[PDB]
């Protein structure tokens, strides 16, 4: 299993994989109880009022001031039972993802994607960037710095606004300069979204109530794909967007969708990024990897005593799949770069995960959400690592009957309809 411990939220802290921690939000905060479910990966069963100090209010603004696709509930994830269920739900989803060859590949890439040690101001020394760490309270009450790659945390005010968040740098654009940074994914396994089986209905903002439910493992995988891009510092600048001209409803509102999202979904959506611009990005990141190779060559000493210089050099030699010559100099091989870049951007896509999970899912990112449902994937009678909602040897096994909210209505509670609100 990906997670070797079936944690309970109430398990006593041990200062190792169950501990109170603080994140580098450049601000103050009370320690929060977190769980390390795998090497380099932690889960914080709390609403995210930490990564952004300006987003500490969970209370919903006045009803006359709320947008379209959003859902508020300041009480969600405030009790121990909810946190226990959150932890178990997120864990089950990691196992579902890991059970597929593609998920195993993606998770392996994420674990190997340690954020680059580029915090030193002296190019002859390698130093870790402290915002890619968390401070863990040890048994003696002292804090120890631990590097990590991924943190799954509860959503902020808008419960359904799932997304990757990471701490930036004063000058370096960590998610776009090949370096990478610790990723905090705002996510919840307790809600899911409804979509429509007919393409003409799903991509229309005036039709459909959301008959089918998105499998939450796909939603998490989508975020993990973004995390992968960001951990390897190859995320596409959000200012690079596709001025949608394939959907009259998007067009009439001048809606734009970032290339990063189209790339992440994959399938035909990825084709909206023309060859010229795609080549531009590839060359850009190829160069970024070259800088990392050179920075490693200029490194003559390492800061800290946790790991040795040769160890960290090998860590990044493996992450970026660099080549080493006779003198021990590092360099980027075009074939290996192209292979890794392609793996992270074309192999790991939402569309491909749908093929592995054998579930029904939106056919394109360019659609309109229909509704949000409350769910509970923790009980095996509701959802399993192997079949998600479509339980084998039951009436829900075929035709995605488990995702059919009308047939499997006992597993879904519609909280809000979005159709017509655009």
């Amino acid at each position: 299993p990906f997670v070797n411990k079936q944690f309970n939220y109430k398990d006593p802290v041990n200062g190792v994989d169950i501990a109170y921690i603080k994140i580098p939000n450049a601000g103050q905060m009370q320690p929060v109880k977190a769980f390390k479910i795998h090497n380099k990966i932690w889960v914080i069963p709390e609403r995210d009022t930490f990564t952004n100090p300006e987003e500490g209010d969970l209370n919903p603004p006045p009803e006359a001031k709320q947008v379209p696709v959003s859902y508020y509930d300041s009480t969600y994830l405030s009790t121990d039972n909810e946190k226990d269920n959150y932890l178990k739900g997120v864990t089950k989803l990691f196992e579902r993802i890991y059970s597929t060859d593609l998920g195993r590949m993606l998770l392996t890439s994420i674990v190997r994607g340690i954020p680059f040690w580029g915090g030193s101001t002296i190019d002859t020394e390698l130093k870790v960037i402290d915002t890619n760490c968390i401070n863990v309270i040890q048994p003696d009450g002292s804090y120890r710095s631990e590097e990590l790659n991924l943190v799954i945390i509860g959503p902020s005010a808008d419960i359904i606004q799932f997304e990757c968040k990471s701490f930036g740098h004063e000058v370096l654009n960590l998610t776009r300069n090949g370096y990478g940074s610790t990723q905090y994914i705002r996510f919840s396994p307790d809600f899911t979204f409804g979509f429509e089986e007919s393409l003409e209905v799903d991509t229309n903002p005036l039709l459909g109530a959301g008959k089918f439910a998105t499998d939450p493992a796909v939603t998490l995988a989508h975020e993990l794909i973004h995390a992968g891009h960001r951990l390897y510092g190859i995320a596409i600048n959000p200012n690079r967007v596709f001025k949608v001209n394939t959907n009259a409803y998007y067009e009439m509102s001048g809606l734009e969708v970032s290339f990063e999202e189209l790339r992440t979904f994959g399938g035909h959506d990825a084709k909206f990024i023309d060859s010229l611009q795609e080549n531009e990005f590839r060359l850009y990141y190829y160069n970024k990897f070259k800088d990392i190779a050179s920075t490693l060559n200029k490194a003559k000493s390492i800061v800290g005593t946790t790991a040795s210089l040769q160890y960290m050099k090998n860590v990044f030699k493996e992450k970026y799949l660099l080549s080493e010559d006779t003198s021990g100099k590092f360099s980027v091989d075009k074939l290996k770069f192209d292979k890794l870049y392609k793996m992270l951007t074309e192999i790991y896509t939402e569309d491909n995960f749908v093929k592995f999970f054998k579930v029904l899912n939106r056919k394109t990112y360019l659609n309109f959400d229909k509704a949000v449902f409350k769910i509970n994937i923790v009980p095996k009678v509701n959802y399993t690592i192997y079949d998600g909602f479509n339980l084998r040897n039951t009436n829900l096994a075929a035709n995605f009957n488990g995702q059919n909210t009308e047939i499997n209505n006992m597993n879904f509670t519609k909280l809000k309809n979005f159709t017509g609100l655009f």
């Binding site: 606004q161 979204f193 969708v257 360019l366 655009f422």
Partner: peptide, 4 residues
């Protein structure tokens, strides 16, 4: 991010 999920999107529209």
């Amino acid at each position: 991010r999920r999107g529209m």
